[PDB]
Amino acid sequence: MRRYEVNIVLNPNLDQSQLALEKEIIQRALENYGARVEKVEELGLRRLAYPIAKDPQGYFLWYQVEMPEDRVNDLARELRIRDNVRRVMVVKSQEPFLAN
Amino acid sequence: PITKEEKQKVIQEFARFPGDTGSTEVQVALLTLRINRLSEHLKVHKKDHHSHRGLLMMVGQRRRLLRYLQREDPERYRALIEKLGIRG
Amino acid sequence: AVKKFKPYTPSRRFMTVADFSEITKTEPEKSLVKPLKKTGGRNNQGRITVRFRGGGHKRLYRIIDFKRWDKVGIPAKVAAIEYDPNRSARIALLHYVDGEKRYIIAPDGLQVGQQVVAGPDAPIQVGNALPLRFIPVGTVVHAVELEPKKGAKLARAAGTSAQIQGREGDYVILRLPSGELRKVHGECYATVGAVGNADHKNIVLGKAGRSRWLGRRPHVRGAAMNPVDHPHGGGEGRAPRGRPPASPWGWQTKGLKTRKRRKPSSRFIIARRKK
Amino acid sequence: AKVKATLGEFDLRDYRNVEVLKRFLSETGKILPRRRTGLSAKEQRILAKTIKRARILGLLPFTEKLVR
Amino acid sequence: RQKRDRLERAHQRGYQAGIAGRSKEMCPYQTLNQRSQWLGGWREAMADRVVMA
Amino acid sequence: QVASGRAYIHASYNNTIVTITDPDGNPITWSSGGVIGYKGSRKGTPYAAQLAALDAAKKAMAYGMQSVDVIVRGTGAGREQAIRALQASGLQVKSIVDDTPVPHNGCRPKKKFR
RNA sequence: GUGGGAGAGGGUGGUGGAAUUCCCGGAGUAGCGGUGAAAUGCGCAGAUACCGGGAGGAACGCCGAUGGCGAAGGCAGCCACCUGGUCCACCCGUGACGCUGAGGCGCGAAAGCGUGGGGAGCAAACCGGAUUAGAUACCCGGGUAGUCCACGCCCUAAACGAUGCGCGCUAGGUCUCUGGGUCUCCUGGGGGCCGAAGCUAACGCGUUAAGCGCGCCGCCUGGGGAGUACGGCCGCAAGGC
Ligand SMILES: [Mg+2]
Ligand SMILES: [Mg+2]
Ligand SMILES: [Mg+2]
Ligand SMILES: [Mg+2]
Ligand SMILES: [Mg+2]
Ligand SMILES: [Mg+2]
Ligand SMILES: [Mg+2]
Ligand SMILES: [Mg+2]
Ligand SMILES: [Mg+2]
Ligand SMILES: [Mg+2]
Ligand SMILES: [Mg+2]
Ligand SMILES: [Mg+2]
Ligand SMILES: [Mg+2]
Ligand SMILES: [Mg+2]
Ligand SMILES: [Mg+2]
Ligand SMILES: [Mg+2]
Ligand SMILES: [Mg+2]
Ligand SMILES: [Mg+2]
Ligand SMILES: [Mg+2]
Ligand SMILES: [Mg+2]
Ligand SMILES: [Mg+2]
Ligand SMILES: [Mg+2]
Ligand SMILES: [Mg+2]
Ligand SMILES: [Mg+2]
Ligand SMILES: [Mg+2]
Ligand SMILES: [Mg+2]
Ligand SMILES: [Mg+2]
Ligand SMILES: [Mg+2]
Ligand SMILES: [Mg+2]
Ligand SMILES: [Mg+2]
Ligand SMILES: [Mg+2]
Ligand SMILES: [Mg+2]
Ligand SMILES: [Mg+2]
Ligand SMILES: [Mg+2]
Ligand SMILES: [Mg+2]
Ligand SMILES: [Mg+2]
Ligand SMILES: [Mg+2]
Ligand SMILES: [Mg+2]
Ligand SMILES: [Mg+2]
Ligand SMILES: [Mg+2]
Ligand SMILES: [Mg+2]
Ligand SMILES: [Mg+2]
Ligand SMILES: [Mg+2]
Ligand SMILES: [Mg+2]
């Protein structure tokens, strides 16, 4: 049990239907590995520095979660597994550090 | 890694008196735990030598303690390696 | 793993056998075998049309499922892993939940008690079969159909596998075990994973006998013949080829490209192999 | 122009504000030296460590062509 | 140790080459221990154009 | 045809080449130190980069090309008198960029560049 | 023991972009490339230059540095998982449990070797072009092992700080890393710099000693012959000891 925060980038051009289904499959999968969601920051589109998937546009999710340490890596695989899923980056949760 | 509960779990078991933290038997059991975890780490990744170094240092330390314990009190020595399943 | 031997006899020195590790059950499904008529490379004319062939150990053919879309959506459990004398690969015994039992060429990594299934809806995991169009590009896959519903042809041999390089129109683009890049119909079933027993290749037969057990009779060089027999036949006392090296039939055997010029099959062949 | 001054109190661990972050790269997208950032030692580490993470996210550029 | 004065030269070579408006950043000696100085010398002087100005 | 457009300057130690393109990027006319009179080390020069850049413009204009963005790739000793002479060739020169490719530490370079 | 830190320390899996090369398409035309200068080479069978698409391998720019980590070799995109070392603070526990270390065991850059992958760039050998009295080189166009991964060997080095390890005692000045504190400073651990006393054949060293002492180990005893031969041991070999 540790705190990580998944960052998913998805297809800009998706259906409300499509998007919802992926958003489902995602939420689904998290449950299966023993991920408990502690938050979501979902930002919708928010365009880019460089063309991920030949696509200046990109669709950003994010979730601050709590799951068993052992199971995280597999999750990220199961996440990338989707044709629409484009980036997945998981990062362990580290209390902020500030300047001036 | 080992987590504080796991440690304390063992620690309280081997402690000679209720408040004991140091105390050769404890120190031993502490190493012993971190050793056997390292062993299994190594059985898996055989390609990690730097970590292996540690193991030898740990095993080394445990040895010294064990000896000292033995030449002060036998019994209490012979009690520990059997209780820890050690020295083959 | 390639079990080795001490050299308590001359042949035993270099000979090596497989480890048979992944093998769970040792006699075949009685319902699933059927005899293999042994030809000795003779055709229905009586005539040897393939040389140096015969005398192997007797074998029962294990019936294999190269279709798999035969049963869509019905999951199955892995009952065992068995030795198949007819192929380089190992076979997996499936118990379908239907109650019907089939064999498949065992992919690498299958364990007993795993669940596999076939079809579009199928999770992408070792042992499952989907039409190629639903298979993520860059995944490695085996036992691939070539034309739709015609049965698996590509990548069945031990250790082999083929990879999906991209889709184009109704087709996906595969890199076959040879390195050929072939367009292959999207509708074609492939099954995710690589063929198991990738250690096959490391086997050193070790003695003439072993070859003879596998049904392979001694091969004789054209050099060792006479002109009646072979292009390289004759010449007094041990000679060099003495013309471009040829087959007994007289066609050139180094480099001479033999695939048919006009084959409709091209136009799906993107790039020849390999290196 | 020391950018730690020109900005305000902010956490560089959080990698997601392309706003706060993008001030910290030269026009070309090159991470800015310690001279230009006005950052300390320990800071500059935690900075680019997170910058890269974001560049991977797609929020910051890896590069840009120089304009005249 | 009497080679200090090679370092000393090359750092200085850089410390003055740094303060220009414009300097090179590309123009050292091909030895190692001498190049640390000139480039890290071109550093302070390129950093001191920042501080103040 | 085209009037608005852009021009690529290839600037190296042995030569300078320019290509005038359409805005889609497909070229219209090209020229280089070689193209006018010059063989060997002479193409490597500033003076040469000039006539090349001009002959590039003067052939752009025969198609009606007027406005062009200069994108610059290289480091030449002809690089300077090339961009220069473009502005001075009678072209709108609507902007100036330097695109030079550099690796992020890619493949190891030849012995010369080590 | 409790409580905190920093870091390219190690192992496994995954993933991001830049660039090189090759392939498909477009657009386009008389040279490109290359040097001190040239030539070989490439190019009207349409190259170089530019645009779009794909394949693939290797290395990770800016951060970045005299910085950091490790016992050494050595370690660098980012992600997670497994794991070593090490620092601080509390003065809580144990009570001399210590230092060193012949043999032993493990690690050990590159090159090299075995098996099977992989191969873009580079590049011993090799082929050309030049330069040259010649040029079995320096420079140029090519190019194979190798360079990469797995597994197993090899065990060497300017493997260097040419400085074995542990503890104690002997001016300070300076900037730098990283902890802690009544935070200008004070204080613990690393990294450099100038230097008291002292050392030294000189150079130089100097609280990171080459000072002043104690413990232990390792090595030296004129140059060449020679790290050769013989023997032994090790290695598939090369070859090591
Ligand atoms: Mg057996
Ligand atoms: Mg019957
Ligand atoms: Mg018949
Ligand atoms: Mg008949
Ligand atoms: Mg073989
Ligand atoms: Mg044969
Ligand atoms: Mg024969
Ligand atoms: Mg005969
Ligand atoms: Mg004949
Ligand atoms: Mg006959
Ligand atoms: Mg005849
Ligand atoms: Mg003959
Ligand atoms: Mg003869
Ligand atoms: Mg004969
Ligand atoms: Mg024929
Ligand atoms: Mg050039
Ligand atoms: Mg770490
Ligand atoms: Mg990797
Ligand atoms: Mg690319
Ligand atoms: Mg083309
Ligand atoms: Mg291109
Ligand atoms: Mg070193
Ligand atoms: Mg750690
Ligand atoms: Mg006390
Ligand atoms: Mg080695
Ligand atoms: Mg090597
Ligand atoms: Mg090899
Ligand atoms: Mg030559
Ligand atoms: Mg060469
Ligand atoms: Mg070359
Ligand atoms: Mg060889
Ligand atoms: Mg040194
Ligand atoms: Mg040291
Ligand atoms: Mg020595
Ligand atoms: Mg020693
Ligand atoms: Mg001594
Ligand atoms: Mg503090
Ligand atoms: Mg200190
Ligand atoms: Mg250190
Ligand atoms: Mg000094
Ligand atoms: Mg001395
Ligand atoms: Mg001697
Ligand atoms: Mg030697
Ligand atoms: Mg001998």
Swiss-Prot record, chain A:
Protein's UniProt name: Small ribosomal subunit protein bS6
Gene designation: rpsF
Chain's role: Located on the outer edge of the platform on the body of the 30S subunit.
Family classification: Belongs to the bacterial ribosomal protein bS6 family.
Organism field: Thermus thermophilus (strain ATCC 27634 / DSM 579 / HB8)
PANTHER family xref list: MITOCHONDRIAL 28S RIBOSOMAL PROTEIN S6 (PTHR21011), SMALL RIBOSOMAL SUBUNIT PROTEIN BS6M (PTHR21011:SF1)
GO cellular component terms attached to this protein's record: cytoplasm; ribonucleoprotein complex; ribosome
InterPro entries: Ribosomal_bS6, Ribosomal_bS6_CS, Ribosomal_bS6_sf, Ribosomal_S6_plastid/chlpt, Transl_elong_EF1B/ribsomal_bS6
Record keywords, A-Z: Ribonucleoprotein, Ribosomal protein, RNA-binding, rRNA-binding
Single GO MF annotation: structural constituent of ribosome
GO BP of this protein: translation
Oligomeric and partner information: Part of the 30S ribosomal subunit. Forms a tight heterodimer with protein bS18. May make transient contacts with protein uL2 of the 50S subunit during translation.
Curated annotation (Swiss-Prot), chain B:
Ribonucleoprotein as UniProt keyword: yes
Spans through the membrane: none
Keyword rRNA-binding appears in the UniProt entry: yes
GO molecular function, one term: structural constituent of ribosome
Biological process annotations from GO: translation
Sorted UniProt keywords: Ribonucleoprotein, Ribosomal protein, RNA-binding, rRNA-binding
Gene3D superfamilies registered for this protein in UniProt: 6.10.250.3130, S15/NS1, RNA-binding
Coiled coil (residue ranges): none
Signal peptide positions on this chain: none
Subunit structure: Part of the 30S ribosomal subunit. Forms a bridge to the 50S subunit in the 70S ribosome, contacting the 23S rRNA.
Function: One of the primary rRNA binding proteins, it binds directly to 16S rRNA where it helps nucleate assembly of the platform of the 30S subunit by binding and bridging several RNA helices of the 16S rRNA. Forms an intersubunit bridge (bridge B4) with the 23S rRNA of the 50S subunit in the ribosome.
Family label: Belongs to the universal ribosomal protein uS15 family.
Protein name, UniProt field: Small ribosomal subunit protein uS15
Highest classification ranks of the organism: Bacteria, Thermotogati, Deinococcota, Deinococci, Thermales
Gene designation: rpsO
Swiss-Prot record, chain E:
Pfam family, one: RMF
Primary location recorded for the protein, binned into one broad class: cytoplasm
UniProt keyword Ribonucleoprotein present: no
InterPro entries: Ribosome_modulation_factor, RMF_sf
UniProt key word Lipoprotein: no
Domain of life: Bacteria
Disruption-associated phenotype: Non-essential gene, 100S ribosome dimers are not formed, decreased cell viability during stationary phase. A quadruple raiA-hpf-rmf-sra knockout strain is significantly outcompeted by wild-type after 4 days growth. Very high sensitivity to aminoglycoside antiobiotic gentamicin in stationary phase cultures.
Alphabetical keyword list: Cytoplasm, RNA-binding, rRNA-binding, Stress response, Translation regulation
Location(s) in or outside the cell: Cytoplasm
Induction: Induced during stationary growth phase. Requires ppGpp for translation.
GO BP, sorted A to Z: cellular response to stress; dormancy process; negative regulation of translation in response to stress
Listed GO MF terms: ribosomal small subunit binding; ribosome binding; rRNA binding
GO cellular component: cytoplasm
Function comment: During stationary phase, converts 70S ribosomes to an immature dimeric form (90S ribosomes) which are converted to inactive 100S ribosomes (a process called ribosomal hibernation) by the hibernation promoting factor HPF. Inactivates ribosomes by covering the peptidyl transferase (PTase) center of the 23S rRNA and the entrance of peptide exit tunnel. However crystallization with T.thermophilus 70S ribosomes shows it binds near the 3'-end of the 16S rRNA near the anti-Shine-Dalgarno sequence, where it would sterically hinder translation initiation.
Swiss-Prot record, chain F:
Ranges of Basic residues composition bias in the record: 107-114
Assigned GO CC terms: ribonucleoprotein complex; ribosome
Family under the similarity heading: Belongs to the universal ribosomal protein uS11 family.
InterPro entries cross-referenced by the UniProt entry: Ribosomal_uS11, Ribosomal_uS11_bac-type, Ribosomal_uS11_CS, Ribosomal_uS11_sf
Pfam families per the UniProt record, alphabetical: Ribosomal_S11
SUPFAM superfamilies attached to this UniProt entry: Translational machinery components
Matching PANTHER family: 40S RIBOSOMAL PROTEIN S14/30S RIBOSOMAL PROTEIN S11
Residues covered by region (Disordered): 97-114
Assembly and interaction partners: Part of the 30S ribosomal subunit. Interacts with proteins S7 and S18. Binds to the C-terminus of IF-3; however exactly how IF-3 interacts with the 30S subunit is unclear. May contact the C-terminus of Era.
GO BP annotations, alphabetical order: translation
Alphabetic keyword roster: Ribonucleoprotein, Ribosomal protein, RNA-binding, rRNA-binding
GO molecular function terms listed in the Swiss-Prot or TrEMBL record: rRNA binding; structural constituent of ribosome
UniProt entry tagged with the keyword Calcium: no
The keyword Cytoplasm appears for this protein: no
Function field: Located on the upper part of the platform of the 30S subunit, where it bridges several disparate RNA helices of the 16S rRNA. Forms part of the Shine-Dalgarno cleft in the 70S ribosome, where it interacts both with the Shine-Dalgarno helix and mRNA.
Gene: rpsK
Protein name as it appears in the record: Small ribosomal subunit protein uS11
